[PDB]
Design a protein around this nucleic acid. Structure first.
Ligand SMILES: [Mg+2]
Ligand SMILES: [Mg+2]
Ligand SMILES: [Mg+2]
Length: 802
RNA sequence: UUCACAUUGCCCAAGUCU
RNA sequence: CAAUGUGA
């Protein structure tokens, strides 16, 4: 299956709230615009170089062509004009000299009708013509692509009149995201602010000082320590410098000592260029070809402007970045608004050429604030908790189903001197108190409590515990902060022996709080098979009247700059009618592949376990799929919808449950703000939990909505977006929106509505745990990685990822 | 490794020419 | 999840 279903209706549930979105309405003319194909030889040039080439070409060849007209260009092969050029489908070949000569061919390809775009935005046309949207994108990006430094769909520039140094030769550049989007109303310009790290365009000498912590360079006047030379080398290698060259290495010898087949560097610069070095003690930059011999003294070189820093920031740099860029929701809103008035898109000569107007104020949108579900607890009292502003508490409440803990052990890997037996005893007493209150009685002292040190001690201790203590339910593992012992505990517990473990940092043992201990109990109960709470059964949407399984799926990709690590696919599935308990599946797969390769096998496993747990076969499968961008919807849907079907088909016998396939995107560039100040919640001033938007700024024909399910603590809340790619079950907007919100209240690790539904959230936890199982380990290769993430038989059916 | 929220890191995007 | 903040 392929085509996403149309929006069935609009939601009606919940009180209204006035909102503003960072979407700016566009007025687009109803005219044909003209699309030309460009070919530039040689063709290996950076996109920015191509834009320059075309810019000169446009100025140079005006009299024959382009005379009044201002073309826009995508930096590759696509040029657009507001009026036609004098051409046929007949190519015209031009020569361009750039202060290098280029051969450029211009060939007519098509007319883009903006009239058709209007119709498609309206009801009239069934589909949105991508190519037309792409053309508008090229118009809006034309000038900023050359005026600023493009990064993704954003643009960055050095800030005028201020500096935000990060140290280490790095600094903060502020910028904005920009994208053109169709909507139920008009075309929209989506604008958000952002910031990212760039290298300071400074003398290399200054760069050296920042990297090596020299106040000034004169200290010392010796050549560098190899370690100093190595550290500097790590930082500058790959960066571009100008006198433009990319640095490929730093010499071991100083410019004075360093020679090449042609004498010394220093002497060459004395002789040929009549320059004498201030600092001939320092090494040279080797630039250009690694196997060649071009060397530049540090003193003659500048880091060239506008190079983004790709490397991870240090902890101090990160701290500085956070402080420089953190903003409340109202402050974020004002910054976007100020940016829009300053950007003045309507005096952009290219936007102007195409007769486009952009509104300078945020679009007004009405939201609805859904009512939260009630949360049912257990014990005698069977207390009901009522969320308010996205939060509830467990005070005077007991777990729906609490586990009695009879046999448990403590392993303390923190040093006895810092985490004493008194600490452990007091922590134990306080934990037992909180746990009894929660209906998860820890009915005695641990059966075993020992200090250990180092990763080598984990496996023999755990094997001893498993072999010795019949009925052992839990090992509480105390850690001295960040340590490789954690990953070893999870390797052994989750994958080697299949034993429940709960780690706790030493600092939270030495000094306990009731809220931390309570939260800890949330995880312990779940890990041991308990049910913390359930949605009030009678408050659930009607989908629950028949057996239904809820799946959450995510792929997590390796960090920036990584070239060989696998991506990790995780799928979880509900295992009861509440829905509360989940089981997990996980796979390693191709580097940076978003499509879940082995999804059919994963879903089959989950369906089998669902039937084993409930003795029902689902009549419906609700699949929440995290993190797929719009440009991947069709490709992902095609493989993954078919994989779900395949799993069903292979199980049985005309078993064809209805599938609802929903993409959840937490990371996108849509922000919503309270119009009225009295609606702003808390210090951060965000929209309230439950705020739902399915009008105005959403898709013109398809079934999508924003739901900000969580209370915003800090900064500006990201309202999660939900796009229904497939729906056999024919949900109404209301039912699916309410279902989705209720699922955000079923996440076991906290008494709060979280920002995405529990199944999607668990899928993330599963993928992250697999990554932990793979630390320093990432056909024969694939099998090794696959073995590493496979949990023990006894762990298979548990919520070990909690 | 108590937990959520937020920033970055993740598919698409972006980027790579003496 | 890691780094860094804001909170419970
Ligand atoms: Mg993902
Ligand atoms: Mg790409
Ligand atoms: Mg953190």
């Amino acid at each position: 299956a392929f085509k996403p279903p149309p929006r069935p209706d609009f939601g009606t549930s919940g009180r209204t709230i006035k909102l503003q979105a960072n979407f700016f309405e566009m007025d687009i003319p109803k005219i044909d615009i003209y699309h030309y194909e460009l070919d530039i030889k040689p063709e290996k040039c950076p996109r920015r170089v191509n834009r320059e080439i075309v810019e000169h070409m446009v100025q140079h060849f005006k009299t024959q062509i382009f005379g009044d007209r201002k073309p826009v260009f995508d930096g590759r092969k696509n040029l657009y004009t507001a009026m036609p050029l004098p051409i046929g489908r007949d190519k015209v070949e031009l020569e361009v000299t750039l202060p290098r000569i280029f051969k450029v061919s211009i060939k007519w390809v098509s007319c883009v009708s903006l009239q058709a775009l209007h119709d498609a935005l309206s009801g009239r046309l069934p589909s949105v013509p991508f190519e037309t949207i792409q053309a508008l994108d090229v118009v809006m990006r034309h000038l900023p692509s050359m005026r600023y430094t493009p990064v993704g769909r954003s643009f960055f520039t050095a800030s005028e009149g201020c500096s935000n140094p990060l140290g280490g030769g790095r600094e903060v550049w502020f910028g904005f995201h920009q994208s053109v989007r169709p909507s139920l109303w008009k075309m929209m310009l989506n604008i958000d602010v952002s910031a990212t790290a760039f290298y300071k365009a400074q003398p290399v000498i200054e760069f050296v000082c920042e990297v090596l912590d020299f106040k000034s360079i004169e200290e010392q006047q010796k050549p560098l320590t190899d370690s100093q030379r190595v550290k500097f080398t790590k930082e500058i290698k790959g960066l571009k410098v100008e006198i433009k060259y990319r640095v490929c290495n730093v010499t071991r010898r100083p410019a004075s000592h360093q020679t090449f087949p042609l004498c010394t560097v220093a002497q060459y610069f004395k002789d040929r260029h009549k320059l004498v070095l201030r600092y001939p003690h320092l090494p040279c930059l080797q630039v250009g070809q690694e196997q060649k011999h071009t060397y530049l003294p540090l003193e003659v070189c500048n880091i060239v402007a506008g190079q983004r820093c790709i490397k991870k920031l240090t902890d101090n740099q990160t701290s500085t970045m956070i402080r420089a860029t953190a903003r409340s929701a109202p402050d974020r809103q004002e910054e976007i608004s100020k940016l829009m008035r300053s950007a003045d898109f309507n005096t952009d000569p290219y936007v102007r050429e195409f007769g486009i107007m952009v509104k300078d104020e945020m679009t007004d949108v009405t939201g609805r604030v859904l009512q939260p579900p009630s949360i049912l607890y257990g014990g005698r009292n069977k207390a009901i908790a009522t969320p308010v502003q996205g939060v509830w508490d467990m005070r005077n409440k007991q777990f729906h189903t609490g586990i009695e803990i009879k046999v448990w052990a403590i392993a303390c890997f923190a040093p006895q001197r810092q985490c004493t037996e008194v600490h452990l005893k007091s922590f134990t007493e306080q934990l037992r108190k909180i746990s009894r209150d929660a209906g998860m009685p820890i009915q005695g002292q641990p059966c075993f409590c020992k200090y250990a040190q180092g990763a080598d001690s984990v496996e023999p201790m755990f094997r001893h515990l498993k072999n010795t203590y019949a009925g052992l339910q839990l090992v509480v593992v105390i850690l001295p902060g960040k340590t490789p012992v954690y990953a070893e505990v999870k390797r052994v517990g989750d994958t080697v022996l299949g034993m429940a473990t709960q780690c706790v940092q030493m600092k939270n043992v030495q000094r306990t709080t009731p809220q931390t201990l309570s939260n800890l109990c949330l995880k312990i109960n779940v890990k041991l098979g308990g049910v913390n709470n359930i949605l009030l059964p009678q408050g659930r949407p009607p989908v629950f009247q028949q057996p239904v399984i809820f799946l959450g799926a995510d792929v997590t990709h390796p960090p920036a700059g990584d070239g060989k690590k696998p991506s990790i696919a995780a799928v979880v599935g509900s295992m009861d009618a509440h829905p509360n308990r989940y089981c997990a599946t996980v796979r390693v797969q191709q580097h940076r592949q978003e499509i879940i390769q082995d999804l059919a096998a994963m879903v089959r496993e989950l369906l089998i376990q669902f039937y084993k747990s409930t003795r029902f076969k689902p009549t419906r499968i609700i699949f929440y799929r995290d993190g797929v961008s719009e440009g991947q919807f069709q490709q992902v849907l095609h493989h993954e919808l078919l994989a779900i079907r395949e799993a069903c088909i292979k199980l049985e016998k005309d078993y064809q449950p209805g599938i609802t396939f929903i993409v959840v995107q937490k990371r996108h560039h849509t922000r919503l703000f309270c119009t009225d100040k009295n609606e702003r919640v808390g210090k951060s001033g965000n929209i309230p939990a439950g705020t739902t938007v399915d009008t105005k700024i959403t898709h013109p024909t398809e079934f999508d909505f924003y739901l900000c399910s969580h209370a915003g603590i800090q900064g500006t809340s990201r309202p999660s977006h939900y796009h229904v790619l497939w729906d056999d079950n024919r949900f109404s907007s209301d039912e699916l929106q309410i279902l989705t919100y209720q699922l955000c209240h079923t996440y076991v690790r906290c008494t709060r509505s979280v920002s995405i539904p529990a199944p999607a959230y668990y899928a993330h936890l599963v993928a992250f745990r697999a990554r932990y199982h793979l630390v320093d380990k990432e056909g024969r290769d694939h099998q090794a990685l696959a073995k590493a993430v496979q949990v023990h038989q006894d762990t298979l059916r548990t919520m070990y990822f909690a």
